[PDB]
């Protein structure tokens, strides 16, 4: 039952829309980028944000996507 | 209350001398502390003085906090007939 509610999806969308040249395919590098370029309070939310950012980046790499 | 006048004298002199009391709500105890008399008539005498309008009382967690107002000081001074230039220990300027 993992659905990744509003906050992570919106934050990842803004992260991609403002930092696409710096984002990569790897989860760990994007995790460090999420740490440095954004002030996520906790770290579980940070990991979820980085994971959805990686998923959206992979979808973009496959092709162009809506939103 | 029927307080023998010497125990009441002790109550009054200690109260005027330093101004404050606690007087645990627990009645029937043998001796009230730093008074060497029964707590029961300590509480009753302070209640009578408060009814007169000389002691402000404040009950919280069974410790009957007592403080002397200015009219209380005047009444105690006249009753204990002490010279009129001495104030209770509260009035002493023990500031910072």
């Amino acid at each position: 039952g993992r659905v990744r509610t509003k906050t992570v999806k919106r934050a990842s969308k803004a992260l991609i829309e403002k930092y696409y040249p710096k984002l990569t395919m790897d989860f760990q590098t994007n995790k460090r980028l999420c740490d440095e370029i954004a002030t996520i309070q906790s770290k579980r939310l940070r990991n979820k944000i980085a994971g959805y950012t990686t998923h959206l980046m992979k979808r973009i790499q496959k092709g162009p996507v809506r939103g | 209350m029927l307080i023998p006048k010497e125990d009441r004298k002790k109550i009054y002199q200690h109260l005027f001398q330093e101004g404050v009391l606690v007087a645990k709500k627990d009645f029937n105890q043998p001796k009230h502390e730093e008074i060497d008399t029964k707590n029961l008539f300590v509480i009753k005498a302070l209640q009578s003085l408060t009814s007169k309008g000389f002691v402000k009382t404040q009950f919280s967690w069974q410790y009957y906090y007592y403080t002397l107002t200015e009219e209380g000081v005047v009444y105690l001074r006249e009753y204990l007939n002490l010279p009129e230039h001495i104030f209770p220990a509260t009035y002493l300027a023990g500031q910072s």
Partner: protein, 227 residues
């Protein structure tokens, strides 16, 4: 004084409860807010945060003095080993206790319930709060009980953000027909909440990227060599 350390800490807590409730009973007319008990090697300092600091001190500084005396008898302390200190509240609007007592006082003078509650909420959000809420429960102009809610802004309810930001106060008011219950909740500004996190758990801030120019292809900018 020898006692088990866990019991000593429990006694320290119950002593703080002692002091807080006693000061609530006494300095209620003073807009009492809170008490801090600092323990030094020699003195047991007791800082009193209240609104009317100058009246709390009293004429010639006697009131505080007599208050000190009571404590020295309540806990069998020694002269000099304990000393009070009166301090003005940093901002009386933010503190729930002071607002609850003040609007209890306003209720005591027969002021309109709705007017007093809305004035309190307006002042609280004038102080910079990120949300205020007031529950007034009781016999509001009727024999049957009823509860009125006056809220503005947003108030969270779950997670220690309930403990971290929003502060609450509960008070009883005695009237000529019954008792009114007052609950006051204020969610402070998280950015100004020092000594802790400075945002909500789900508050995400993204740094705006810096804009740069890429056209410089060869650009071999030689520096002076060193050896």
């Amino acid at each position: 004084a020898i006692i088990s350390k866990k019991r000593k800490l429990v006694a320290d807590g119950v002593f703080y409860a002692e002091l807080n409730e006693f000061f609530t009973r006494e300095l209620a007319e003073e807009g009492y807010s809170g008490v801090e008990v600092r323990v030094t090697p020699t003195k047991t300092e007791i800082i009193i945060r209240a609104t009317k600091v100058q009246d709390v001190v009293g004429e010639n500084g006697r009131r505080i003095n007599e208050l000190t005396l009571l404590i020295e008898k309540r806990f069998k302390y020694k002269r000099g080993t304990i000393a009070l200190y009166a301090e003005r509240v940093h901002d009386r609007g933010l503190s729930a206790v002071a607002q609850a007592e003040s609007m209890k006082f306003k209720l005591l003078n027969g002021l309109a319930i709705r007017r007093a509650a809305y004035g309190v909420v307006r002042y609280v959000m004038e102080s910079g709060a990120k949300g205020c809420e007031v529950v007034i429960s009781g016999k509001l102009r009727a024999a049957r009980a009823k509860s009125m809610k006056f809220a503005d802004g947003f108030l969270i309810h779950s997670g220690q953000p309930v403990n971290d930001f929003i502060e609450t106060a509960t008070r009883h008011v005695l009237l000529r027909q019954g008792v009114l219950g007052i609950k006051v909740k204020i969610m402070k500004d998280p950015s100004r909440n020092t000594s802790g996190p400075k945002a909500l758990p789900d508050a995400v801030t993204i740094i705006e990227p810096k804009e740069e120019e890429p056209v410089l292809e060869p650009s071999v900018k030689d520096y002076r060599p060193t050896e």
